[model samples]
Target: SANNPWTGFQIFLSPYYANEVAAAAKQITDPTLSSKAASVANIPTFTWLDSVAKIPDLGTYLASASALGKSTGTKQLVQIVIYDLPDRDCAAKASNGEFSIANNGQANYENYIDQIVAQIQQFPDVRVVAVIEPDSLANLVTNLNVQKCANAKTTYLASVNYALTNLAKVGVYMYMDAGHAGWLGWPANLSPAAQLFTQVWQNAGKSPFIKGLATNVANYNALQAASPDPITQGNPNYDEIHYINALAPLLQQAGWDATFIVDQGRSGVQNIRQQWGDWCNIKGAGFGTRPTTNTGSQFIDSIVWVKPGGESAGTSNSSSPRYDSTCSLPDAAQPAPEAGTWFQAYFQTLVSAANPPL
Candidate 1:
C-alpha cells in the first residue's frame, strides 16, 4: 500500500535515542566532539525492538514520533527493527536472545510479533518500517555449516516466514535482513543466497509488504569502499553498493524484485577489521552517511541507520556467555558492553572520526 516508505517522508528519530544521544553528548567535555555527538540526533537512526519485553516501548516511541510530526507539519517514518527470533544469532552469542527454539521460542516469538503489531496498530498515524530478523536469513546463508546455525535453520526460516505473514497484515513497510557485503558478497554465495531468500519468500507466500532488503546492520562495511581491504581483495562486492548491484538482480529474477537499504551508521571507516567478516564492535570505527534517499541507483531505496549507532556490538568479557571473539579481536573495540547496550567511550570515538566530519 506504500511506495518506498523512506522516500517522501522525514524519518522519525525516537526519543529513546534522542535521550541516549543527548546523554552521550552531555558526557562529552570536548566542545567540538560534544556537538558532533549531538548532531547525530538529527539523523533518523533505528530502534531495535529485539526482545518481546521491549514491545511496549514501541507505543511511547510512536507517540513521540506522531507528536513531533504533527508539531513540525511533516510526514514521519519510524523504522523499528523486529529482531528477536527463536535461537536468534545462531552463529554467535552476542545476540542469542531470550528463547531458543526448544524453549518454546517459536510460540513466544509469534506472541511477540502479535503484540508488536498491536502496538504499531495503536499509532495509526505513524508510518512504521520493520527490518525483520537481522542475521536470521544471513546466518542461514553463510553460517549453516556451524551445527547450531544448522540446527536453528528450520525454526529461523519458519519464524521469519511467520513474521512476513503477520507483518503483512499491518500496513508497515518491511525489509528482510540481508547481511553485509563481506557475508553474501562472495560470488559463490549469490545464487544460493538469493535462492535461500526466495525459499523464505515462498514460505511467506511471497508477501508484497516484504518490501526489500537491509544490509550492514551492526557491521562496519563501507557503503562505497574507495579501497577494498586486503581481506575483501578477490570479491568485487567489496562495498554495500557493489554488493547491492550484484545481488539485487538475482533477487529480481527469483521473483523477489527487491529494493535495498544499506546501513551506514557504524560503517564510516574501512579497512580496519583484522578480517573482513568481523562484525562486532570494531575499534576505531566511525559514523558514516546520515539517513538519506539520495542513493544514485534506481534499485537502491535509501541509505539509513538500521543499526543504532553507539550500541555495543557485543561484550568483550570472556566470561560472558554472550561474549563473541569478534568483540575481543585486536581490531574489535575493547571493554565494550553487551550487544545492544550503550558504549560511551566508543561513542566518543565514533563521532570523533565521523566520515563527513560531523
Candidate 2:
C-alpha cells in the first residue's frame, strides 16, 4: 500500500447488483423499505469474473466506470473477483466451476487470465482491484484432507501465480485471498499460512501490485469483534483486525508486503453462526462496513464489500448436485437460491439489519 490506488477514488458501483436490487425493490409493500432495499444498489460491491462467459462483461464494467469517472470529475475504481480455477472451490461444492486440471482446465484458466488482462488494457482510464481466487490457497492450507482439494493443489498454485503475473502487467491492484479469522486466524494456522502465501508471492516473481491479503470474502467476521466470537472462543484473532494483526508481520518478515482489505459485506451482525466455518447465507445476517480507506490499521487498505450482498452463498436444496451440506446448517438462511443467485428474502434481512442502519 505504499502507493494505494484506491485513495481519492470512488469505488465503482455495479449495474449487476443494481439490476437485482431493482427487481426486488418493486415487490416490497412498504415504500420506506423499498427505498432502503434500493439503497443497496448504490453501495459499491465487487463484480465477479468467475466464468469465461463473464469476460465480456468486464469490458462493459470498465467502460461504464470510466465514463462515470469523467462525468463526475473524480477517479473511479472497479473491484472484481478473479474466481475461476481448475477444481475450483474444492472444499465446497456450492461454488464449483467448469474447470478440471485433468481435462486441460488449467490451460483454459491461463487463457482466462490473459483475456482479462487484455480487456483491462483497453480502458487505461479505469482502475481495477482484484480479490484473487477466494477459497483457493486457504484450501491448500487447511482443507487438503478433502480429496478434491488435494487433487487441486498443483493447478491451483499455478493458476494463482499466472493470475498474479498477468494482472500485475496491467497495473491492477491485487489482494491475494486469505481465509478469515476462524479459518486461518487460529494459532496453529498463522505461521504455515504465511509461509504458504510467501511461497506464492515468490512463485509469482514478487509483483509489487500484489497488494497483500484479501480477508473475509463471503464471510461474517466482524471487523473488530467486541469480544472473541463464541465459535472462536479460544482464538485471539477472533476479528479481522486481530486476524491481520496476527498475520501482517509474518508476511513482512518473509519479505512480503502485507497490506490488506477485509470484506465487511456480510458482517453487520454477530454470533450468527453455529460454527466458525459456516459461511453460507446465514439466517439473520446483515450488510457491514461501507468501502473506505479509513481502516484502523495503516496496513488495511480498506474495509470493502468484496462479496456481492444480495447473492446467495449456496442453495439450501440438499438434493441438488452442487449442494453442500454447509448450506443446510441450522444457522443458514432458508429457501436460499443457488450460489451467486439473488436471494430476495436474505437481501431484505441484510438491509433491515444493516449495522449502520441503511
Candidate 3:
C-alpha cells in the first residue's frame, strides 16, 4: 500500500465515538467482549455524513476538518460517506430521509454538495476521500417500480454528474457507490450497471475524475465467498471479490479502472441466517477485515469499515413514522434505538461474535 498512489493515507478516528468507547469499556462484563472492545477502541472508522438535515452546518464541518488536520499534522486521510439522495433508500425504511424530486430535491442536493466542496477547499492541506451518494444508482436499477425511484432516475444521474463536475476541481478523491455485490452482481445486472456508470463518467468528463467504485456501503454482506446455508452458497458471482473481478474488465473497456474499497464492518459473521436479504441491525453480525490498502487484488484498493458498527440501522419499535418490519424481525436485536443511535448491546455482540475473534 505504501508504494501505491494512496500512500500515507490517514485513517480518521472518530472523536465522536470516544465517549461510547469509554462507557463500553466500563460496562463490558464478559472478558472476551471486553478485550475485543478495547482492541477497536482506538481503531479508526469512517464518519458518515448521512443526510442533508442530519449533518451539522457547513461551518461546523469545515471547522472539524480544519481542527482534525492540525491535530494529525495533516497526515490522516478523512473518509466521509455522503448519502443524501432524493428519496434515498427507496426500497427500505430504516434510514430514509427528506429529499424528493417533487420538492426541488436535485437543486437542494447540488447546493448541499457545493457547500461541502467549499468547506473542503477551506482546509487546503487536509486530505479527504468523499464517497458520493450511496444507493442512488443501485436503487435506480433495482427498484424502478417504487414510485419515487421511478421519478428520480434522470435527475439522479444529473445530480451525480453535477457533484463530479464540481468536486473534480479539488484535490479530493471521489468514489461513487456501486451498491454491494448482492444487489448488482448478476450477469444480467452487471453490464447495465457498468453502462450506467460509464454514462455518468462520460458526462462528468470521464476518467481521471472518479477514483473508483465503493461496494457494500452500510450493508452486511461477507467480503469473501461463503454461504450461511451451504446448499446455495450465494451465487459465486455475488461474492464481493468475484463481483469485482467480473466488473473490472467491463469498467476498463468503458474507460476506467475499477479500484475498490469494500465495507467489511458487519460482514464478519456469515453463518447466521434468519431470512434472505435481511439487512436491519442483524443478529450475529460482526466486524470483518479492518481498513487497509494492501488488498492484494490490483483492482481493490482497500477494505474499510464504512458503516460504524454500533449504530442501529433502525429500531424494532420506533416513535418515528418511518419504520420497517425488517427492524422488528424475530431475530433482530430488541428495544432497538432509532436508525443512528449508538446501541451498546449491539456493539458488544459485533465484537464477541467476530468471525476471526478480533
Candidate 4:
C-alpha cells in the first residue's frame, strides 16, 4: 500500500455453490421452506451469465446500469476472490493429471476455473487478481498426509499453471497462496513450507497470473515485525512476524523477489490467540502488519480477507470453536465488519445473501 500504485480486484467464481446450495435448499421438506429454497436454488440458473462479463456490451444489464449516465464513485482495483469451486472437497476427488483432458471428476473445479480464465482473457484493461485456489492447497497440507495429499497438489499445480499460462495473455497478476503463518508455522520450518509454496508458483513456469505469495489470510496481527530484531525488541515472546521475517531472507536467498500480500481482513482487532496455542478460540489479535511499498521485501501486499469476515465456517470437522451458534457457522464469530455487532450483521447480511449468485 505504501509504494505500490497497482490496484485490482480478485476475480472469484463459486461454480460449486450453484449446486451445493441447491442441494442444501432442496433438503427442506416443509412447504414454506421448500418454496423459499426453490427460489434460492434458481438464482444461478442463467447460463448467459457464464460469459457475459466478457461481452463487449451486455444487451440490457449494462445498458441499465450505465443508463444513469456516468454515475460512479471511487473505483479502486476490485480483486474478487471467487470461491467454493470444485466444491470445498476438491482435494478429495482431484486427479493427478490434466483436468482438461479427461473426466478427472474434478469437473466442477476444473470447469469453473477454466471458464473464467478463458473469458477474462478478452478484457485486457480490467485489472484482476486470480487467487488460484485457497484453502485447497493449505488444508491439504494441514489435514492430509504428504504422500496421499500429493494427488491434490498434483492437480492444483496443473490448474495453477493452466490459469497462469492462459491468463497471462491478458495482464492479470495471480497470487498463489502461502497458507496463513499459523499453517506454515505449525511445523515452524519455513524452508519446507516456503519451498512447497515456491514449487507451486514455479509449477506455472513463471507466468503472469502467478505474482508471489499471500499469508495470514482472514486474520490480522501486529504490524508484521520489520525483522526478528524489531519484532522481538519490545516483546520477548515468540512473535509470528519474527518467524515471517526470518523466512524472508531464506526465500530471497532462494530467488523469491515477487510481491507478497497479507490478509488484514479480520485482524483489525489483532491478537486473537488464546494463550498462544489454541487455534480457533482466541480473540483480539492486532491488525495485520502494515502494507509496504518496498520491492525488496513486503510482509504481504495489503491485508484482504480472501474470506470476508462474518461468513460462516459451516458445520465440519475442522470448524472454528467460537462462532458456531450466532451464524450457524461451524465456529464462533470474530471482530465485526462495517459498523455493527460483527457476528450479527455478518450473518444477517452475508450468510443470508450467500445463496448462489445470479
Candidate 2 minimal-lDDT segment of 10 residues: 91-100
Instruction: Mark the regions of model 1 whose C-alpha exceeds 4 Å error after superposition.
Output: 93-95
Q: Name the regions of candidate 2 deviating beyond 4 angstroms.
A: 93-95
Residue pairs in candidate 1 whose N, alpha carbon or C atoms collide under 3 angstroms = none
TM-score of 1: 0.96
Encode model 4's per-residue lDDT on 1-358: one tens digit a residue.
Answer: 2334244222222233334445544555555554543443222111112222422322232232232223443222324443432323343322222222234534544565566656555444345554555555675555556444544555555555565666566666666656555555544456676776677666666653466666655433433433332222333323345445655666666566555666543444433343332333223222222232332345555444454333333322234332223222323334332211123333223323321211
Task: Report per-prediction Cα RMSD to one decimal.
Answer: 1.7, 1.2, 2.7, 10.9
Task: Give TM-scores for every candidate, taking all chains together and pairing residue i with residue i.
Answer: 0.96, 0.97, 0.90, 0.57
Steric overlap count per candidate: 0, 0, 2, 32
Who wins the TM-score comparison? Answer: 2
TM-score of candidate 2 relative to the true fold: 0.97
lDDT of 2 by residue, 167-277 (tens): 999899999999998899888899999999999999988888888999999899999988767998889788889889989999999888679999999899999888887
CA lDDT of 186 in candidate 2?
89
Model 3 TM-score (2 dp): 0.90
Error of 4 at 246 (Å): 2.7
Q: Residue 333 deviation, candidate 4, in Å?
A: 4.3
lDDT of each: 0.83, 0.89, 0.75, 0.43
Instruction: Report the number of the highest-lDDT candidate.
Output: 2
Error of 2 at 184 (Å): 0.6
lDDT of 2: 0.89
lDDT of 4: 0.43
